Amino acid sequence: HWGYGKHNGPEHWHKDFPIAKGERQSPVDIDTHTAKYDPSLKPLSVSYDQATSLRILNNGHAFNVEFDDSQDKAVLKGGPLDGTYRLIQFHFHWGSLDGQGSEHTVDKKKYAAELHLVHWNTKYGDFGKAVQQPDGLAVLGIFLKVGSAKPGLQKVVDVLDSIKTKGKSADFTNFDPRGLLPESLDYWTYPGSLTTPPLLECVTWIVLKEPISVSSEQVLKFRKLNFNGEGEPEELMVDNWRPAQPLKNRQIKASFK
Ligand SMILES: [Zn+2]
Numbered sequence: 001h002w003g004y005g006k007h008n009g010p011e012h013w014h015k016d017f018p019i020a021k022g023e024r025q026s027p028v029d030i031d032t033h034t035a036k037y038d039p040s041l042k043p044l045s046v047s048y049d050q051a052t053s054l055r056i057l058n059n060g061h062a063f064n065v066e067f068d069d070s071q072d073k074a075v076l077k078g079g080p081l082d083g084t085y086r087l088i089q090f091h092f093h094w095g096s097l098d099g100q101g102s103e104h105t106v107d108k109k110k111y112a113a114e115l116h117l118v119h120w121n122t123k124y125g126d127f128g129k130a131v132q133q134p135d136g137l138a139v140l141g142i143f144l145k146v147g148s149a150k151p152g153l154q155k156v157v158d159v160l161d162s163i164k165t166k167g168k169s170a171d172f173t174n175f176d177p178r179g180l181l182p183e184s185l186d187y188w189t190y191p192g193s194l195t196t197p198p199l200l201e202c203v204t205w206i207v208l209k210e211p212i213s214v215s216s217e218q219v220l221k222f223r224k225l226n227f228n229g230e231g232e233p234e235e236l237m238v239d240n241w242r243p244a245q246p247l248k249n250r251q252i253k254a255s256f257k
Contacts, residue, residue, distance in 0.1 A: 002197045003061065003227065005235075010242045017197045024201040025245035026192030027103035030252055035188055038253040044079035044185050044206070046140070046178075051087060053175035056159055060166035060227055061196060062091040062240055065156065065175060069120070069127070074177065076119045076138050079206055079255065080189045085119035085138040088127055090177060092116070093195075094222050096238040098146045103195050103241045104207050106143075111211060112219055113144035114241070115180060116195075134191070136202040142182065142212055149215035152179020157221045165230040182210035186256040195242045209256065 051074035074087035094113035095101025102111035130136030
């Protein structure tokens, strides 16, 4: 009832999910000329040394690399955040062409893909409770451009053949998400939403300025995934991004000058 096709894509989502037209929807365009440096942001803290990946799942819209979130093992703190946010999963959005695929844009520039590392605020006890709160989630967004390969992505790429179709999962232990980060942690932040239904307005977005580079061959393997289930007509999983939404009564703050 929702997807990225010709008849169920983002422009239709409001019928089942009326917050699609809400006040704090994501993604947005980041205008680097109007985002203002905020010297109050605290330092941002990514603590992934104890991360425990478990599984990778094709959910029919993207693939999720899932983590054990039953202890503070991989946590995000600092920056704009109060308290501790635990990593639950990461996933990507990507294009059919290298000139599109990201959800956020920077001065209207679209990147080839965008990585979302999803974390929930431990004060709410579990993810399902957290998404009901305005400060329930913190999503670290990282742009991907096509150039050199990202060595830390290759283990993800190589398992995709085993999860080609919707509903397939595979064991995916011992994956280190630190290998997906750029050098700099400079970021923009603003209050927003999930970018897929139910589109809940529960996210503090933290979008890194520095993209990571992936190779053409790595992105091509993302584009071999399928939206459909096994034994259904093949529909390539491409262009699984929501376009920028109105900023409305929000300000984007920068961590850097
Ligand atoms: Zn996402």
